[PDB]
Design a protein around this ligand. Structure first.
Ligand code: NA
Ligand code: NA
Lengths: 176, 176
């Protein structure tokens, strides 16, 4: 049938460098070959649309930027049929996306998999006033040493589900 | 050696029912038997510490509460060596935690696994002014049909990593 061997989508966007008051841009290229996704992520002061570099003539040579945040600032979230990310290659690319030089490879660390459940049950005042409780239970298989988890309690009246009576206070966090 | 066959921890906390201005409580019991974690989650107006029901005599019998939020309000996050959660049993428990009746079982839906990378590389003004870019790349294996993902771009000066130049605007989201 001569089906495509890969499909690639390119996303761009922009923000503002607060220090020099100029636009800063990102480009995210994602390629799907059927076996794996390949991500290529670039931060630059060159507009991807016009290929023109912004006016940063006053930018000092020692000024430096990161393209990633702290270990707790999630940048990538993956669906259930995507496996474990590889190491992250870091490098400097020229105006045409070609590698100028490369730095040390980074390691992906997970913040964990998040879950919720639908068709939530409810407890009425008739039961509540008897001292009854609304209870949910589930099990989670253990496949190795890292059995860490976090749990966020939730309670809300049925006609205003958005207002959490616990408001984020009593979060349960368990290491290692 | 007669090693314990299981270990259990019980977490409690409290919030406020805005409508009736009374404390509302949660209890989370987590049991580890080596093969799986078992979670038991209860929302109630009975104080777990004193075993005393708050004053909700004015609570109308038709008043109802949920113990969970929307499909996007993450309540449980699991570490890398924890597998896929089972179905969630829903039921009403009495003052002593015994089942009074049960409702329909709920289904856990994942919000995905979150990731970040450390040892982030940096680009200096000398390179930026050449029209160069800071680039990271990685691959992700595909094991099924759901290859959805989200990506949040990030850029910050190296002496103030906390201020994201993209501020959350250009988030990349891909279905199904
Ligand atoms: Na964690
Ligand atoms: Na998703």
């Amino acid at each position: 049938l001569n089906i495509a061997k890969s499909e690639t989508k390119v996303y761009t966007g922009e923000g503002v460098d607060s220090v020099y008051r100029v636009p800063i841009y990102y480009k995210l290229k994602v390629t799907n070959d059927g076996s794996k996704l390949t991500f290529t992520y670039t931060v630059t002061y060159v507009n991807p649309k016009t290929n023109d570099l912004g006016n940063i003539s006053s930018m000092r040579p020692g000024y430096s930027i990161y393209n990633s945040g702290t270990s707790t600032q999630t940048m990538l979230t993956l669906g259930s049929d995507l496996g474990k990310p590889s190491g992250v290659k870091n490098y400097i690319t020229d105006k045409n996306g070609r590698q100028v030089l490369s730095y040390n490879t980074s390691t992906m660390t997970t913040q964990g998999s998040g879950y919720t459940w639908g068709n939530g049950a409810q407890m009425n005042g008739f039961f509540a006033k008897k001292g009854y409780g609304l209870t949910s239970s589930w099990t989670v298989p253990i496949t190795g040493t890292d059995t860490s988890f976090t749990f966020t309690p939730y309670a809300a009246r049925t006609d205003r589900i958005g207002i959490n009576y616990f408001n984020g206070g009593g979060k349960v966090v368990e290491s290692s």
